[PDB]
Design a protein around this nucleic acid. Structure first.
Ligand code: NA
Ligand code: NA
Length: 327
DNA sequence: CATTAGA
DNA sequence: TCTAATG
């Protein structure tokens, strides 16, 4: 956690560079299992060989550990951190819609900068176009203060369209967070569940509403279950407009909401830990269900859930308010 | 790990 | 169809 720091950090830098700049899934994959284990290791690694005794660590990485331990740096690291090509990939990548694949390509073509991106708006697809358009705003954190505003709006219309609609804003905003990155809304409806062959309009109806009134201003992607877009708060009485924020809505079979809701609310840890608990408690928990465990090794049988409570109950835990779903 | 664009 | 990018 801190005794192993630089090492895992150096090691993570390396991985990340392979995967992105190079097309080396493997090396990239090496660095991480490595960085995975060395971080688990309970003692101050004092040398290559020491590390080396580890699983997944070999000569490659050891050698790296020495140099790093020896001098507070790394050449390959100083070299990469320096390299424009590689620098470029890292950056181009920030653009929502641009991954590494594209980033490489853009680069090979000579698109390095934000501006170059503009001059060639044409090479970019719709997504990347919006991404490039809202680049600044995309990078800005969302104030809970605004979070509250947005949430207020979406609930309102939802209800308006159909009253049988259940929506929840999941994420850290759900967990009390002072700010959020983007907004996640989970949605379901009673008439849509595990079997009942869809009702795509169900999603659509609401997207429509939202735009109707001008909350949604762009659409990154719309499918019959998951809409991915851009939203914005009504720029009040002039002098101050809101930044364009990312928003995602997802339709869910009413019969899988809470787990899902459980799950998205997190935190990543609270999940795992809770998840790890249900195991002893004779169960299994995933993004959509909760199955009583059978002895034969495994087992099915989706238990019926009507609230976050049904879940907690099942594993005989304490209902944890989201506030404290911190871990 | 699942969904959507795209070509 | 496959392959990319988001979550
Ligand atoms: Na080894
Ligand atoms: Na990106």
């Amino acid at each position: 956690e801190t005794l192993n720091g630089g090492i895992t950090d150096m090691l993570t830098e390396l991985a990340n560079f392979e995967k992105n700049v190079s097309q080396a899934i493997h090396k990239y994959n090496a660095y991480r299992k490595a960085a995975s284990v060395i971080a688990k290791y309970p003692h101050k690694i004092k040398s290559g060989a020491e590390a080396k005794k580890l699983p997944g660590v070999g000569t490659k990485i050891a050698e790296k550990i020495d140099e790093f331990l020896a001098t507070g740096k790394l050449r390959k690291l100083e070299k990469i951190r320096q390299d424009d090509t590689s620098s470029s990939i890292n950056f181009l990548t920030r653009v929502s819609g641009i991954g590494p694949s594209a980033a490489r390509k853009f680069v090979d073509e000579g698109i390095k900068t934000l501006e170059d991106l503009r001059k060639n708006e044409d090479k970019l697809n719709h997504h990347q176009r919006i991404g490039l358009k809202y680049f600044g705003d995309f990078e800005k954190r969302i104030p809970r203060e605004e979070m509250l505003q947005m949430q207020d709006i979406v609930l309102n219309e939802v209800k308006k369209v159909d009253s049988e609609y259940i929506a929840t804003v999941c994420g850290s905003f759900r967990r009390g967070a002072e700010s959020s990155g983007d907004m996640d809304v989970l949605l379901t409806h009673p008439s849509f569940t595990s079997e009942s062959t869809k009702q795509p309009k169900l999603l659509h109806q609401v997207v429509e509403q939202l735009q109707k009134v001008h909350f949604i201003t762009d659409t990154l992607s719309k499918g019959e279950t998951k809409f991915m877009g851009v939203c914005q708060l009504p720029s009040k009485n002039d002098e101050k407009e809101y930044p364009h924020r990312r928003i995602d809505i997802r339709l869910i079979p009413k019969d899988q909401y809470y787990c899902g809701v459980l799950y998205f609310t997190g935190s990543d840890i609270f999940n795992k830990n809770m998840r790890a608990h249900a195991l002893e408690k004779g169960f299994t928990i995933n993004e959509y269900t909760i199955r009583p465990l059978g002895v034969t090794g495994v087992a099915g049988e989706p238990l019926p859930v009507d609230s976050e409570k049904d879940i907690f109950d099942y594993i005989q835990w304490k209902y944890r308010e989201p506030k404290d779903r911190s871990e």
